[PDB]
Design a protein around this ligand. Structure first.
Ligand SMILES: N=C(N)c1cc(-c2cccc(NC(=O)[C@]3(Oc4ccc(Cl)cc4)CC[C@@H](N)CC3)c2)cs1
Ligand SMILES: N=C(N)c1cc(-c2cccc(NC(=O)[C@]3(Oc4ccc(Cl)cc4)CC[C@@H](N)CC3)c2)cs1
Lengths: 236, 5, 236, 5
């Protein structure tokens, strides 16, 4: 750990600075260093961790999609052979993406999830675990693809079970978990009907609980509800 | 692509 | 050189792929590998090199500015001491920026400039040399700042002298060189009047030569002329 | 910031 000599508090401070500078690779490295101090993460710290790696892997995924698109075209009937370079470079980006996912999954397994007892932390981390297995699933093609998919499903399912028992239906973590598990169903598990059912039921149960919220909590919940509706509009 | 958070 | 085992043509192909994927660090690494094959660069290849490193250093510069701004505020009268972290992280980004600049300047010195005999290549590379010394100047504060500034000035001046002898006033390389040397005068050399004079004279000499151009060359030249006018509007 | 290319 190249961050082993830096104070935990300094790592968190620098993660916030890296965010302001839109230096998300640095942000992720600082937050990995903070996790490796071994202490549990506060709510703010968990979100710094998730923001950092979401931005890093999001860029990798966007690049992979561009390259995969170019690669598939080079393989159509009538394309001029261009050699191994597109495949090689897609593989390079894919391997770096898998590395980032494995890093995040490693942090969750050593030892964030096992120490997470409160619903807000445990559901958050299990959602992340589902998310990063989902990103691995997006690029998987081998003997392991079904097992990667089932790892994502299992993490999301455990998070869902806890969230339904322990959080109100408007809790933004619960909502974001359902949003993403719904996308998993649609895009990974070839289960569009499950995706649509989950998004719709989540939206309706949240709507009925909005009356309990403050203005600020209302804004947070309705933002994610709008994403659920956006996806439903995309899919119907 | 669909929205995720 | 980690690219030493890859074919020159494969490096150029992958640079173009990296560009499409907005992976500019990769793009720059591929083009550095291509330069290190030792052959001169074609027009397209020179622009791949410049696009890659301009994007990399541009992001570093934007980050440095954010962090420098935060640092200066932390040093105002009334600010709460936050410790060494802002300075340290600004220094980290600054050192990485200086490294990229030194890398580019190294490629130009070994041995792109000395082999560049045609005006279009030689002016292009000397403009780059001015640009990357200018980026070093932006962060310089020590015993070397004046010498860094004079290195930028000298490279720009040699490029200007060649461009005025060997290129028409509408040549986009000549125009972009003048644009950037004008910014050097305004932002680095504390010579706003020289900056304004150079931009205005460049614009007017180009305007008078537009009648010689094809429609496509006209579009290229007038685009950079509009940047000259934009800066003049900013400065007057 | 001013324009450069
Ligand atoms: N970036 C930072 N420095 C910090 C961010 C936070 C912080 C703390 C609690 C919730 C949030 N919500 C979000 O990020 C957003 O909603 C989420 C995110 C994650 C989940 Cl599972 C659920 C909902 C806001 C709305 C956006 N469309 C999507 C992200 C941020 C503390 S610090
Ligand atoms: N990105 C790629 N794959 C490639 C780009 C090129 C290529 C070749 C010749 C000129 C250009 N001009 C430019 O880039 C732009 O003008 C310049 C750039 C550099 C100079 Cl010194 C002068 C003018 C177009 C207009 C933009 N506002 C600023 C950049 C690009 C070949 S390949």
């Amino acid at each position: 750990g190249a961050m082993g000599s830096m104070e935990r508090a300094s790592l968190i401070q620098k993660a916030k600075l890296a965010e302001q500078a839109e230096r998300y690779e640095d942000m992720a490295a600082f937050m990995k260093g903070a996790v490796e101090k071994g202490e549990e993460l506060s709510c703010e710290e968990r979100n710094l961790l998730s923001v950092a790696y979401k931005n890093v892997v999001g860029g990798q995924r966007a690049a992979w999609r561009v390259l995969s698109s170019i690669e598939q075209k080079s393989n159509e009937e009538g394309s001029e052979e261009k050699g191994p370079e597109v495949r090689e470079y897609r593989e390079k980006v894919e391997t770096e993406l898998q590395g980032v996912c494995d890093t995040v999954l490693g942090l969750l397994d050593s030892h964030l999830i096992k120490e997470a007892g409160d619903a807000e932390s445990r559901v958050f981390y299990l959602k992340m675990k589902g998310d990063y297995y989902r990103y691995l699933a997006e690029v998987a093609t081998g003997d392991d693809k079904k097992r990667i998919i089932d790892s994502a499903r299992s993490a999301y399912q455990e998070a869902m079970d806890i969230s339904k028992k322990e959080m109100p239906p408007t809790n933004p973590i619960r909502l974001g978990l359902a949003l993403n598990f719904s996308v998993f169903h649609y895009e990974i598990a070839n289960s569009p009907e499950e995706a649509i059912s989950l998004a719709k039921t989540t939206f309706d149960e949240a709507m009925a609980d909005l009356h309990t919220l403050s203005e600020d909590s209302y804004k947070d919940s309705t933002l994610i509800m709008q994403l659920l509706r956006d996806n439903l509009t995309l899919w119907t | 692509f669909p929205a995720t958070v």
